[PDB]
Structure formats: C-alpha cells, structure tokens
Amino acid sequence: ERHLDDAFFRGYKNLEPEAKAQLRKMLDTFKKDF
Amino acid sequence: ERHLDDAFFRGYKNLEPEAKAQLRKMLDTFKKDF
Numbered sequence: 001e002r003h004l005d006d007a008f009f010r011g012y013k014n015l016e017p018e019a020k021a022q023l024r025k026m027l028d029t030f031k032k033d034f
Numbered sequence: 035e036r037h038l039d040d041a042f043f044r045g046y047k048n049l050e051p052e053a054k055a056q057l058r059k060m061l062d063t064f065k066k067d068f
Contacts, residue, residue: 001051008058009043011065017035019064024042026060030053031045 012023046057 004058005043005047005054008046008054008061009039011061012042013039015061015064020039020042022064023057023060024038026057027042027045027049030049030056 012020015023046054049057
C-alpha cells in the first residue's frame with residue numbers, strides 16, 4: 001500500500017505538467033461520482 | 035505547482051483502493067506513451 005502510493009507520487013511529479021493536470025482531473029472525476 | 039501536487043496526493047490517498055489503482059494505471063499509460 002504505502003510503497004505503491006509513494007512511488008506513484010514520485011512518478012506523478014516526474015510527468016510533464018499537462019499530464020499531471022490530467023491525473024488531477026481523473027481524481028476529481030472519482031470524487032464527483034457520487 | 036507544489037501545493038496543487040501535495041493536495042492531489044492527499045486526495046489520492048483518500049480514494050478507495052480500486053480508484054487509487056486506476057490512477058496508477060493512468061500514470062503508467064502516460065509513461066508508456068513514447
């Protein structure tokens with residue numbers, strides 16, 4: 001769990017800004033699906 | 035930049051595990067698109 005999550009965050013921070021923005025948009029889609 | 039990213043990580047950690055897995059899959063899709 002924690003190691004998968006911390007590696008994910010490091011990978012996310014290595015993405016181009018436009019790709020990071022798309023991951024943030026996906027997160028919002030999950031949050032707003034209720 | 036940093037504040038958007040840190041808030042994103044906190045939001046990601048609050049998702050259900052199955053949703054977190056989908057965000058990790060999206061990250062891999064960006065990484066493998068070269």
